[PDB]
Design a protein around this ligand. Structure first.
Ligand code: FAD
Ligand code: MHF
Length: 492
């Protein structure tokens, strides 16, 4: 049944393990450790061992480490404004896989992974007291929901006050402390930010981790990774398109696959606007979202590729694209919750429709427009959508359907494996024209976009069976009778 189903990476479990081992070794910290006492390493979206500063700082300042992951109940409630599931089944499955792999990789280094179900502010203070932990390490987050959790955990520790919460920044290519400006003065135009950081910042080298990470505390029950039904979520199968394999191993496997095995890095720029297949682009996003791989690691591999293979505009463009990710992270700090408001960071006034019927046709891939439906179907079936497609469906929902852009944003939040509040709401803000950079505040012509990015209509055909046997031109505009009625006319 795995017909037209593409495993990402395509590598077999065996190949992934092999590639992962040699990657770990290539970056291993040569055979020192001072520190003292016990320390708790709280994960949350940085599910990897490699370039992990929180892990290093933890090991560097202790005798024994207790790595922990809390399955936050809130993660499986509903979305903010329109109440879609907080985490869709596909991303949930990806997460479980990430935890399985993280535990495996941690055990390889003499550690393990304590899995607990509950709120971090309740679990961590308890564990800190039970093991007499001196500190709790973890990465610093930026959006309000995550920052609020940090506050609660911090106050929880004090409420019990011999354990300090140590939040380490580390999720971007360029470090926050190395920027040419304070985040409050982040340029509102990406171009200004990009040029500025490229010329005045320099990227830090990846943090090398020892192959042996000392012992863990005693612990009589490390728990286990839940099924999903146990979490109130019903497993979902990818029936066509890309599946995506969770975990750092698979992630490092994809970098290897895209750069070295397939040698596609040198042509990335000329294919990045594709919409069909795993080859047109990196496909790193889901692993970057859960922190299974880091941008600094990617940068090092790009440099090694430019040193051993070739260097051109394509090898560079992957970095250019990672600066977009960095930009939205910093933007989330400067914008705060205005990133989530209807008026956006520019607080634009006006009214938008929340027409349930219209939104449902968009979400259900039944708008009558092949280019639109194909993308929406890919999204709900695989949890991924090309950048080109995301831009298009955003323009369509906002401009053509005139719907509250947040309805589209939250649906993306439910479905995307690579969902990230900064990137998601950041880009939606751009496309919906409610941000402070007019770059994407225009209009995407479905007919033009379809012709330029899917001339043979093979993308739309791959997803919409009704168009499989139709000629090139019919795939672009099949007509209501050969496809279905259009839920709304085109144009503002
Ligand atoms: C309306 C809209 C909403 C989006 N919401 C999210 C989201 O919640 N999470 C998410 O990870 N991506 C989001 N994107 C992502 C962008 O389209 C994807 O980051 C890129 O397609 C992801 O992987 P790739 O392999 O296709 O990219 P390439 O293969 O294009 O890889 C470039 C890498 O750089 C980063 N990147 C590329 N483009 C962007 C961008 N425009 N903004 C931020 N980072 C970028 C990613 O980490 C990506 O893996 C959104 C795009 C739009 C238009
Ligand atoms: N990963 C992630 N982190 C988040 O913080 C987050 C998401 N995802 N998904 C979308 C929701 C919604 N976002 C929001 C939206 C609005 C406010 C807000 O209006 N706050 C008010 C005060 C509200 C109150 O006091 O009840 C404010 O003035 O800022 C906050 C967070 C945060 N969200």
């Amino acid at each position: 049944m795995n017909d037209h189903i593409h495993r990402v990476p395509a590598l077999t479990e065996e190949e992934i393990d092999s590639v992962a081992i040699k990657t770990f070794e290539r970056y291993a910290l040569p055979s020192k450790r001072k520190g003292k006492g016990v320390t708790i390493l709280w994960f949350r979206n940085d599910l990897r061992v490699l370039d992990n500063d929180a892990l290093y700082k933890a090991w560097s300042s202790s005798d024994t480490i207790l790595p922990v992951y809390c399955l936050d109940p809130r993660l499986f409630h509903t979305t903010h404004f329109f109440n879609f599931p907080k985490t869709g089944a596909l991303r949930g499955g990806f997460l479980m896989e990430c935890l399985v792999d993280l535990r495996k990789n941690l055990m390889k280094r003499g550690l393990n992974l304590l899995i607990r179900s509950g709120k971090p502010e309740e679990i961590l203070p308890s564990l800190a007291k039970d093991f007499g932990a001196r500190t709790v390490f973890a990465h610093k987050e930026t959006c309000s929901e995550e920052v609020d959790v940090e506050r609660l955990v911090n106050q929880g520790l004090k409420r019990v006050n011999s354990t300090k919460l140590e939040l380490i920044w580390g999720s971007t290519m360029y470090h926050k402390d190395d920027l040419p400006f304070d985040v409050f003065d982040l340029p509102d135009v990406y171009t200004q930010f990009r040029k500025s950081v490229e010329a005045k910042c320099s990227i830090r080298s990846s943090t090398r981790i020892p192959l042996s990470l000392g012992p863990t505390p005693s612990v009589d029950d490390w728990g286990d990774v839940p099924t999903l039904e146990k979490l109130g979520v019903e497993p979902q199968e990818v029936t066509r398109g890309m599946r995506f394999v969770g975990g750092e191993s698979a992630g490092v496997g994809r970098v290897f696959e895209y750069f070295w095995k397939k040698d596609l890095l040198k042509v990335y720029k000329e294919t990045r606007n594709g919409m069909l297949g795993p080859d047109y682009s990196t496909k790193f996003s889901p692993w970057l979202a859960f922190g299974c791989i880091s941008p600094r690691f990617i940068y090092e591999e790009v440099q090694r590729y430019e040193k051993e293979r070739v260097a051109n505009n394509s090898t560079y463009w992957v970095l250019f694209e990672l600066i977009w990710r960095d930009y939205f992270r910093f933007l989330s700090i400067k914008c705060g919750n205005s990133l989530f408001h209807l008026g956006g960071p520019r607080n634009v006034q006006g009214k938008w429709s929340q027409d349930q019927k219209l939104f449902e046709s968009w979400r259900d891939a039944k708008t009558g427009y092949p280019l639109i439906d194909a993308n929406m179907k890919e999204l709900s079936t695989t949890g991924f959508m090309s950048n080109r497609g995301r831009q298009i469906v955003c323009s369509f929902l906002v401009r053509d359907m005139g719907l509250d852009w947040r309805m589209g944003a939250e649906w993306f939040e439910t479905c995307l494996l690579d969902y990230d509040p900064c990137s998601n709401y950041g880009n939606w803000t751009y496309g919906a024209g409610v941000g402070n950079d007019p770059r994407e505040d225009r209009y995407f012509s479905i007919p033009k976009q379809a012709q330029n990015y899917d001339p043979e209509g093979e993308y739309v055909a791959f997803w919409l069976q009704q168009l499989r046997r139709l000629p090139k031109e019919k795939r672009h505009w099949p007509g209501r009778l050969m496809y279905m009625d259009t839920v709304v006319p085109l144009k503002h």
